[PDB]
Amino acid sequence: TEMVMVDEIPFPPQITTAKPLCLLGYGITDIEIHFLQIKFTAIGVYLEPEIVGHLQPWKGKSGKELAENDDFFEALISAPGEKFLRIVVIKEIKGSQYGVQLESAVRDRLAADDKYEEEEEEALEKVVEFFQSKYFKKDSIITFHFPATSFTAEIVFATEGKEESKITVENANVVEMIKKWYLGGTRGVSPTTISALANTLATELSK
Amino acid sequence: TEMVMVDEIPFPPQITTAKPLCLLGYGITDIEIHFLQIKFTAIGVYLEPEIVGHLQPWKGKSGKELAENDDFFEALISAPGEKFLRIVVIKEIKGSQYGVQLESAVRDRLAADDKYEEEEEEALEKVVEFFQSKYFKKDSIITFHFPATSFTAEIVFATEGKEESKITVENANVVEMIKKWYLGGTRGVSPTTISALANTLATELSK
């Protein structure tokens, strides 16, 4: 089966964790400023096809109204089942620059919920340390696997030449805010990914 | 004599037009966002040493107070004498992306002064057309020469391989707003260049 080209970067149409997962959304992170676009990463979102059954309260809704519906994305983020994010570096950067973008996104959300406590701080520190020790060359790959059987996340960094590097995040709140960074509707870091997911899910939910 | 390294790009310490001109300020254009710096261009500002005599109303002022003094930079922009800007591309871009940044900076200033009239529009169109036909490879060089003897500007684009390409801007108002884009104090496109000029001129004005 053919790779899906996401802004000229190949993505598998299916990934298997504990279950077969389908590519149901993809997009990029970028900035458009001074009449210029600069692309940072490409993203693929992999979900169980059965997620359409968990999202039946939104059947008949269009992609445009699902794209602006933060309750919908809240349900998707918390739906039961396996989930997997695949991120491919476009602009080379220091690992610690992604670390701090992540840390700031997670800390901000924890603080807003008053959940920035000892365990969250310790878990987030371990994630920051993990990225601090990496260099994100172009086509490097970060993956976030969210298993259905625990409120944890396994983070893998892969780059040609080196062996895969891995950590497991054990704090549920930190794991939730990582999911929200990428998947929280109008607050997601990648509006293109949100629109693709929302359009793909609206179509599946109409059937 | 040694080249002056401006963020790893060489700049002559002196350029000769109608008169010998000294490098009195240099800096970069950049964006700092998402905990990351992206550098667009390096700038050198070349002025007659005699400009210190035209700026005597600001003698005894420090670099920090000259850096926040828009009357000072207004006097520098309009002072008599030869002036030369040298811009070296760091991030490769389309010519039309610099064209539109320029056009938007000039048009905005003309509009604020209600000077966006037929002649200005025609002159600015010719500048936009000039850049539209170029590709700004890294280390390409844009120079703006402002002669003391007319209210005009000669723009030169140079890149290795190709011959120099040149146009002459004949509209005084457009030429003034180009100078202000780069040199207008707290409104300049390059705060680093402003600070360097202001510190260099403060020191010379103290002698």
Residue numbers in the entry:
A (entry chain A), B (entry chain A): 41 to 247
Q: Which lines from the publication concern this structure?
A:
Rectification of CHS catalysis occurs through direct protein–protein interactions between CHIL and CHS, which alter CHS kinetics and product profiles, favoring naringenin chalcone (NC) production. The chalcone isomerase–like (CHIL) protein family is noncatalytic, yet it shares a “CHI fold” with CHI. The protein X-ray crystal structures of PpCHIL-A and VvCHIL reveal CHI-type α/β folds with high structural homology to each other.
When the structures of VvCHIL and MtCHI-I bound with naringenin are aligned, a significant amount of the VvCHIL pocket is occluded. Similarly, a variant of VvCHIL with the Q141A substitution does not undergo thermal destabilization in the presence of naringenin, suggesting W221 and Q141 together are required to facilitate destabilization. For VvCHIL, naringenin binding produces the opposite effect on the thermal shift relative to PpCHIL-A and MsCHI-II, resulting in reduced protein Tms at high naringenin concentrations. The VvCHIL peaks calculate to 26 kDa (major peak) and 68 kDa (minor peak), indicating that a minor amount of VvCHIL is stable as a multimer, perhaps as a trimer in this experiment.
